[PDB]
Design a protein around this ligand. Structure first.
Ligand code: ADP
Ligand code: ADP
Ligand code: ADP
Ligand code: MG
Ligand code: MG
Ligand code: MG
Lengths: 370, 164, 370, 370
């Protein structure tokens, strides 16, 4: 009866039933093969470790993400993570409840085809559907009008949606996301005397960026304050026991979202892609899209990103237009919230692709249906 | 680096790159291909009046502008060059100038290092030039196909009024 | 004595003297600022790169087009490109030979005013003239009757011309051209696993569209053949060494010329705008305009575009009328051919706007003269 | 008038004037405190020994490297080595000729700040500059395009450089270098019955690796030849008089450069980091970076490392692309060659940071200038 919604993101896998507020299953999407020979005999040494067990034993593992910027690079570990979150995390079978998968727009069709094939052949689900992460994150907002700024761990994409009709010709996609921010933070933290080279360590930098990084109102004056005094510096407690003192890196690595020239990308920052997509949209819907900029994803959780997004957009947009940046306090899981509120809808229950519909169509039904 | 350029070479380059409306009697003494050298003290880039090619003579005394130009380069010393090519592409007919950096292996190191480290001092002063041709061996510069390969690649069907 | 004709197009700049068959100077109209700091010292690093030197060094540059859909967005780089094509490409001075400029109809007067001001103040030409690209492309055809389908890189416009008297009230303008086709190809190539985000890369997609794209006789049956088998797929040699396998994208992105709903435009395709303009024309000239559809520009170089244009027009036009689509083999430079054949005409030599005529008139003589 | 170039490397200090081919001063960068009480009275017993005098008296000393993987661990001995190479080795004063220092990319700013402070306060140089080792090693090659594989004694780093504009976002850094290879050789030589525990002895293993180690074309077949017969074994003359017989250790310890899992590092070998950095670079410069892999440093002096680097790169790179590995016969000092050819350049003579420029700026001018 109930439906499963599985937000297979690049950094986290939010999986839970339909009709509830919060996702019960949340864990990093990485698999870890044992790095060392393992002299001790017995104790249950396994070939792989998924999620929290990998996070706890990350010292002797070699963590890696199966999903790049949205595309699934490796498939065996992806279906392994799916089997894990289905059996060892939710303790349910896929043959009973329909599953709901999410993806980013401007996605290779091979990824969706392999998703459908894996879901229908290995697990044999009665029905499923492949929605868009940004559209669901807009559902969670309760409204139907406004452009969505969805930026997760691997991809940042924006799609403007009017009063039910979205604009596919203005869908912008930026490969700059949280993983690139973590890489830039690792690259700029070596200038302080802290080398993070290995994948296992990189997670420490990820947590440091998650709980110590913020976006400045403006770059120049915050640098001037960084240059003068240590009033800005703050210390962190490392798992090994040492302490580090980061200064301008607290707001320099989040600035890459607005100035991609730091990691080398030529793409316009997240504050300019939205304005360029709205300027590519229709001239009557711009008044409604300017005052509705729905943000989602874990990357939009920095303290002060909403204020800078606002300021930049009213700097780009005309003065008479008013800019509003909807910053929900549960925007980290807004995609899952939208999927769960979508799965309970009665009108949507008819457009699930079913096995009986899938047999004659093959793995190509997903493009024509979704 | 070191060695800089003189005023005569800059004047010659500005004279060759930008042509103006000229009389039919004077237009025949324009500079077609001129080389560059060093003085006794090796401090300025000077053109030698001895070895040169006029635009007037091309097609008359000089049956082949490129063919008579390969033998003009000395094989025992390093030299610069400036060749005005008139090649025909499948797409269209173009007329560009080519910078040839002649540097044989038989030349002494004192003439190779000076001309290699001061190449940015001359190439920067030659504004608007695009086709760069670095040639070290004599056989590679003697061949006719290499000029069409550097200029436009496989697209150049004819070079200097004759097909490849 | 001789006159210069400079077709300052949106994608290419065809510049050459008058009285000759082919333009000697052809290069893309982009300027590139250095993207990286440039650690190496010396070697002649420049502030900008124009044309083929930018195409060769496009890896470290950030290419951008000064001309949008016909309007000149930035003026400093435009006059820089003009100075380049005058001095470093043709090696001639503008003070001696008169220059001939081209433009698309339904053009903002500010663009033509700035063109005239730049040509008369910076270069100080003895005389000049601002013609229309489609009228010149019709001159190159040797005839005087027939509507012109001029579609370059930024704008597609159609103007019907009778036996010397053109119809300005039926001049249609469509902002759909080769740049929009390249953008659509970039957007639809990400579904195969090839991401082209940066401007430098986009040129690779441009060449792929130039030498691998064709227009189908009809969309439906070609899709049916695309759906079944790989008999249609063809591989391409990328500059980096990799190979790509494009399928329906060979004829899907050129279909935007006839179905603008792909990139989101609401404008009728190039096959319907011509018919609507002819139906807006006079009822006695329709018989002569139906059998004379002169095509020009680089966008009309797809294999099979002439056959589809024909079929569509005889589908729209009455049956008794016969439709002819003049597809010249030099229609890529037809505007330049017409300009060069026009500059040699003796009757035209009297209507050049001269500096002595320009002094008292200011930059407003161009509207009343041309 | 002349300028000093001082390549303060992790294992050697190449110091010499500008404008000459070879560095006149070459010696190991270690300081040695007297280990034993020293019963004999007189004879000039000193508190420390630097360079060749330490190498000769290494029996009674405790050698240690002030520079780790590129960062300077201890500062008193570093400035002592600088004073030594300035006075007791070159017999010149720093107050007259400007000095040129080198460093590896992705270096802590504290190291460069302390370098500048020591050079400007203790020695009071008129001017100086802090360049990059790989950029200078590329200068020595005479060309401007190509990625540099710089691997010394403490750090291996790669930076791709195009026609004057380098790419800082693709700068890879690997902490695997010659010191790690020496440690691995010491660890794997105990399996033959030769224990090297002390620092003084470790230098014998260093020379053994320098003059008896090579990199195999492939690991598997060379192991098969090592397993069968002693055709591979070779003897060495120890300073004490004994002889040793090393077998597979001749090509096992240099394999760590390509398989870091031997010493435990998780980093991709030197053959994969270059390919990953080029794949992170721009798509138009990859064709020029693939055919230009400039190698430098003393670690790249193994017989057969160029062939294996080639084979591995054409195994990773596409087939149509051609791979070239520039292996110069003076790549052991290529950084010093580039520094010396750089110091004679006239254009570079303007960007030296001077004392008058340093006074108001403090030790922070180096980041904004270099
Ligand atoms: N409190 C926080 N502050 C800043 N960044 C955060 C915070 N929490 C998570 N992130 C970043 O957000 C990323 C998670 O993205 P997520 O929303 O899970 O993407 P997806 O929905 O595609 O899985 C992490 O990589 C992390 O770097
Ligand atoms: N062989 C070809 N096949 C298909 N399209 C082409 C071909 N050659 C050029 N094009 C397209 O035509 C455009 C050039 O338009 P062009 O005729 O130069 O416009 P303008 O005359 O305004 O400069 C390019 O952007 C390219 O995409
Ligand atoms: N002939 C050789 N064969 C193999 N390795 C060598 C050889 N000569 C030197 N080495 C290694 O190279 C290292 C010296 O590195 P070097 O180039 O001096 O680094 P840096 O330039 O940072 O000082 C030494 O530690 C030694 O192990
Ligand atoms: Mg997401
Ligand atoms: Mg045009
Ligand atoms: Mg070194």
């Amino acid at each position: 009866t109930t439906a499963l919604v599985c937000d297979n993101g690049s950094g986290l896998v939010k999986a839970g039933f339909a009709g509830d507020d919060a996702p019960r299953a949340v864990f990093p999407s990485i698999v870890g093969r044992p790095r060392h020979q393992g002299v001790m005999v017995g104790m249950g040494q396994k070939d792989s470790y998924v999620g929290d067990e990998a996070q706890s034993k990350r010292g002797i593992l070699t963590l890696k993400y199966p999903i790049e910027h949205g595309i699934i690079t490796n498939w065996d570990d992806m279906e392994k993570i799916w089997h894990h979150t289905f059996y060892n995390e939710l303790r349910v079978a896929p043959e009973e409840h329909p599953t709901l998968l999410t993806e980013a727009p401007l996605n290779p069709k091979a990824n969706r085809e392999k998703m459908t094939q894996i879901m229908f052949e290995t697990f044999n689900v009665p029905a499923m559907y492949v929605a868009i992460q940004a559209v669901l994150s807009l559902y969670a907002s309760g409204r139907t009008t406004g452009i969505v700024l969805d930026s997760g761990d691997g991809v940042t994409h924006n799609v403007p949606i009017y009063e039910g009709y979205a604009l596919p010709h203005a869908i912008m996609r930026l490969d700059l996301a949280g993983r690139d921010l973590t890489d830039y933070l690792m690259k700029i933290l070596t200038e302080r005397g802290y080398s993070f080279v290995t994948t296992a360590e990189r997670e420490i930098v990820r947590d440091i960026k998650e709980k110590l990084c913020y976006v400045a109102l403006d770059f120049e004056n915050e640098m001037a304050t960084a240059a003068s005094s240590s009033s800005l510096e703050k210390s962190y407690e490392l798992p090994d026991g040492q302490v580090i003192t980061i200064g301008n890196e607290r707001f320099r690595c989040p600035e890459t979202l607005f100035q991609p020239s730091f990691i080398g990308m030529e793409s316009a920052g997240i504050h300019e892609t939205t304005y360029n997509s709205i300027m590519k949209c229709d001239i009557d819907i711009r008044k409604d899209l300017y005052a509705n900029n729905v943000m989602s994803g874990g990357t939009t959780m920095y303290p002060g990103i909403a204020d800078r997004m606002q300021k930049e957009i009213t700097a780009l947009a005309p003065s008479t237009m008013k800019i509003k940046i909807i910053a929900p306090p549960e925007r980290k899981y807004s995609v899952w919230i939208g999927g769960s509120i979508l799965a309970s809808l009665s009108t949507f229950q008819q457009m699930w692709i079913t096995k009986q519909e899938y047999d004659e169509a093959g793995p190509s039904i997903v493009h024509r249906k979704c | 680096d070191g060695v800089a350029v003189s005023d005569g070479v800059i004047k010659v380059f500005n004279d060759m790159k930008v042509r103006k409306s000229s009389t039919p009697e004077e237009v025949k003494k324009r500079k077609k291909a001129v080389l560059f050298c060093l003085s006794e003290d090796k401090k300025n880039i000077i053109l030698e009046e001895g070895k040169e090619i006029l635009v007037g003579d091309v097609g008359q005394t000089v049956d082949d502008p490129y063919a008579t130009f390969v033998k003009m380069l000395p094989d025992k010393d390093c030299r610069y060059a400036l060749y005005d090519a008139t090649y025909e592409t499948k797409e269209s007919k173009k007329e560009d100038l080519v910078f040839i950096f002649w540097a044989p292996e038989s030349a002494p190191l004192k003439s190779k290092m000076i001309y290699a480290s001061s190449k940015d001092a001359i190439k920067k002063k030659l504004t608007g030039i695009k086709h760069e041709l670095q040639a070290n061996c004599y056989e590679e510069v003697k061949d006719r196909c290499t000029l069409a390969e550097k200029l436009g690649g496989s697209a150049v069907i004819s070079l200097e009024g004759k097909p490849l």
